[PDB]
Design a protein around this ligand. Sequence first.
Ligand SMILES: Cc1cn([C@H]2C[C@H](O)[C@@H](COP(=O)(O)OP(=O)(O)OP(=O)(O)OP(=O)(O)OP(=O)(O)OC[C@H]3O[C@@H](n4cnc5c(N)ncnc54)[C@H](O)[C@@H]3O)O2)c(=O)[nH]c1=O
Ligand SMILES: Cc1cn([C@H]2C[C@H](O)[C@@H](COP(=O)(O)OP(=O)(O)OP(=O)(O)OP(=O)(O)OP(=O)(O)OC[C@H]3O[C@@H](n4cnc5c(N)ncnc54)[C@H](O)[C@@H]3O)O2)c(=O)[nH]c1=O
Lengths: 331, 333
Amino acid sequence: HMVTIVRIYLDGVYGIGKSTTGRVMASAASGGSPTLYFPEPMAYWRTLFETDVISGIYDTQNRKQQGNLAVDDAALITAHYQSRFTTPYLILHDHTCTLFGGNSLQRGTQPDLTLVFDRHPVASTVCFPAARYLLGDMSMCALMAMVATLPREPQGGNIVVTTLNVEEHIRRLRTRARGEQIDITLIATLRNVYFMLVNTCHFLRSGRVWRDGWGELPTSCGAYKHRATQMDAFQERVSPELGDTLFALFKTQELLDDRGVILEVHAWALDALMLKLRNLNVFSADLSGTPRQCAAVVESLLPLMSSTLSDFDSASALERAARTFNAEMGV
Amino acid sequence: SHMVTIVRIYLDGVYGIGKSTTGRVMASAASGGSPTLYFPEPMAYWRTLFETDVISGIYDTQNRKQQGNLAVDDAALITAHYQSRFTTPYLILHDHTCTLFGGNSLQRGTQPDLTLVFDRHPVASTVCFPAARYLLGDMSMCALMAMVATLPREPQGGNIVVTTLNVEEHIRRLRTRARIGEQIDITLIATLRNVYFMLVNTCHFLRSGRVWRDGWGELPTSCGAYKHRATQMDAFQERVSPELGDTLFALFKTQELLDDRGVILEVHAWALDALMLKLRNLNVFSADLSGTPRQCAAVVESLLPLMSSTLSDFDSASALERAARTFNAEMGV
Ligand SMILES: Cc1cn([C@H]2C[C@H](O)[C@@H](COP(=O)(O)OP(=O)(O)OP(=O)(O)OP(=O)(O)OP(=O)(O)OC[C@H]3O[C@@H](n4cnc5c(N)ncnc54)[C@H](O)[C@@H]3O)O2)c(=O)[nH]c1=O
Ligand SMILES: Cc1cn([C@H]2C[C@H](O)[C@@H](COP(=O)(O)OP(=O)(O)OP(=O)(O)OP(=O)(O)OP(=O)(O)OC[C@H]3O[C@@H](n4cnc5c(N)ncnc54)[C@H](O)[C@@H]3O)O2)c(=O)[nH]c1=O
């Protein structure tokens, strides 16, 4: 008994609908075949240790403004809690990775098993870090630090970057939290970072590498940074330029030598990013309709996705991992 | 298509023991053996390549701790951030060289076509130093987990040699560099020494073919006492037949990671699994450096019969030679 598994990482900017979405896809209410959902590791972040890292992050963007903590220092304290967000993702990823199996193909069929992970390690190792850096809240050096910890995606992974029109995105961000300030720049920049990420996988699928069109590309400075904070600045592109992708932000003096050439060690890092994101078959989804509709939109690009071949012990082991994960990541 | 036999060695252990000097000799042709490339410590990355020198910073933040001007709360957060900054260049190097070692790792008891000495394995900055900072109360168990998790998986064929030294001689050396009213910081040194014994014992335990679970639920729930004892000099040693108590696993049995029943949470057992898996491709050895640089170089060398080799190709071997040349340039001073 071999099993055909398809794994989906649902990802994108927060407050868009994605968690409702996967949670619906998982629930017995959608039909199709067995669908297991791995939720966000909330408990890990909030209750399992003395410090609640979400409550800590913003607590520091407050302090840094409230004229009470060195601006230099909140860039370190925040860098740190950004690190803490990654941990449970890396643990999950380590545990699940042996079990997905091999023989990744686009089979066209329905799989015996469907997994939906709420977010891929890329979100908290590259994307959120990249955004905090563009906002000046975190240094290049520190972005490097985090990007370096992204694990290699094994074969057959599928990442669906969820999207939404801005209007509606603001409506759903008020319905959830008010009192506290929403942070419209973080949202604007994250929207851009996620487009950049999507562009990046399309870039790689098109067979290019980060060196291609690197010389031509302009150095990326205050001007380029600020632009990533503006809304709509970037968008999905099936044939992107280098500058439409995540690599563009790494061309800065910080990483360049006396004559404008990127250091070999830094090229190595850009190399590793490109390696790690390569087994990630990229898709988009607009989360405009109702949770049930959103679900069927994700479920509709199932025939396009990458399936693996697993043995019946591991299937079982993933389902156990599913049960446990939902259980302990509780609240 | 031409087949090259590589053996890689990670020299590791407590700082100030002689390891970097040893490695430079193993590289030097005068020490015979097989051609040796030596990847040094990523100094430049840490100190010069960015606006902040992680070595200055770190201690400058332990200083503002005792010396009122910055919170005790923040120190264990800025210090952790800096500990994380130490690991970056090692992860980068690891990612660059890993896909070049090739496979077929088989302890072949002969001299290899070539030898790579890396100064330190990712384990040093993602497990060992973090573990010691936690045992000293400078860092939380949760911060620890945030770093333990970022150990990369060692591929087949990795050999790690934990360097050792009697305490007299080790201290002597420490004062030999340093110089002029600089404090040493025995406290850390003592804990790091214990952590590295825990590590040699850990991989033994694991090669033995034991898992972290064997003997777990009968092991004393480690907390207050255990932390003191980890910081006490020579509390730990290289055990011949190590048990769970002697290993790095012991320190993760704390209230912080159990439920109301005294049972480790499953997500925590997973983190424990990961670490056990990565620590399974490292062939572990210990080497003593009381001899002279040459003697030391020979002590590590004589082990080679015991070490494991991978088969790479000529074009890969030749990129390692560049890799080593590049790393050496970009990291000096
Ligand atoms: C990963 C990461 C996160 N964070 C920070 C950023 C955030 O401030 C915070 C929590 O981030 P979270 O992702 O853990 O949890 P949420 O804040 O809940 O954001 P989500 O990731 O869950 O976004 P979703 O949009 O997937 O969440 P969801 O709850 O589905 O959507 C929010 C609201 O929209 C409505 N909704 C959902 N679907 C809807 C639909 N189809 N129609 C109408 N409304 C819909 C629901 O009523 C819900 O109230 O953590 C970091 O700082 N660094 C990091 O690396
Ligand atoms: C990796 C890491 C480092 N740090 C911090 C802790 C430390 O304070 C600092 C040093 O970082 P480093 O280890 O790159 O720099 P060093 O302090 O130089 O330590 P080494 O790695 O070089 O240790 P070694 O023992 O290899 O250094 P070495 O210079 O070889 O030895 C010290 C002295 O002993 C003499 N010596 C060497 N071999 C000798 C021999 N055989 N006989 C007699 N003397 C010998 C040498 O002349 C030298 O002066 O960085 C962290 O906080 N966290 C981390 O994760």
